[PDB]
UniProtKB/Swiss-Prot annotation:
This is Myoglobin. GO terms for cellular component: sarcoplasm. O2 binds at residue 64. It catalyses: Fe(III)-heme b-[protein] + nitric oxide + H2O = Fe(II)-heme b-[protein] + nitrite + 2 H(+); H2O2 + AH2 = A + 2 H2O. The modification Phosphoserine is found at residue 3. Its main location: cytoplasm. Monomeric. Keywords: Cytoplasm, Heme, Iron, Metal-binding, Muscle protein, Oxidoreductase, Oxygen transport, Phosphoprotein, Transport. Residues 1-147 form the Globin domain. GO terms for molecular function: heme binding; metal ion binding; nitrite reductase activity; oxygen binding; oxygen carrier activity; peroxidase activity.
């Protein structure tokens, strides 16, 4: 797990995201979709976004970005005691949305990239280490639920 010091770093970094949840959410999803087009296909409502300009101009994409980061933020604030919050998310993503765990790795990487992109020089090595541990814990706990369901893709 993460140490108290690491969780404090995670939540300090998260404060940066909370100042502009929509902007961060939008950029994380655009980073995901442009770097891994196959992920866009999992969203029937975003499949029409044929270009990054259309992605940038989509208010519904920003809306979903807000939903995604709000959910992740809720989980992070639990500092690992997130079973009740994480289980339903893991189950909807495996059973309803059919999201392979690889795509969760992709979005975790996108979050780290967006943090550096929006806060260059202000997302330190310690902060990156802590946030990475938090995202890995998140991903790994979802993976355990995916294994329970026998879900691969
Ligand atoms: C940080 C990771 C993620 C978080 C916190 C997150 C959170 C959410 C939430 C809260 C919802 C709405 C409630 C629900 O259906 O469970 C949702 C819906 C959805 N998610 Fe995610 N998600 C994550 C990653 C992904 C990834 C990586 C994909 C696909 C590559 C994905 C695909 C979907 C789809 C298709 C929906 C339904 C969208 C719609 O048509 O309204 N999610 N997600
Ligand atoms: O999502």
């Amino acid at each position: 797990g993460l140490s108290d010091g690491e969780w404090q770093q995670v939540l300090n970094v998260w404060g940066k995201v909370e100042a502009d949840i929509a902007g961060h959410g939008q950029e994380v999803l655009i980073r995901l979709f442009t770097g891994h087009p196959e992920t866009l296909e999992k969203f029937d409502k975003f499949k029409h976004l044929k270009t990054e300009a259309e992605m940038k101009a989509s208010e519904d994409l920003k809306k979903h970005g807000t939903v995604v980061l709000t959910a992740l933020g809720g989980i992070l604030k639990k500092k690992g005691h997130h079973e009740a919050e994480l289980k339903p998310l893991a189950q909807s993503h495996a059973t309803k949305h059919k999201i392979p765990i690889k795509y969760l790795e992709f979005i975790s990487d996108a979050i780290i990239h967006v943090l550096h992109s929006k806060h260059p020089g202000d997302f330190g090595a310690d902060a990156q280490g802590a946030m990475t541990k938090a995202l890995e814990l998140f991903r790994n706990d979802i993976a355990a639920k995916y294994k329970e369901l026998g879900f691969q893709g």
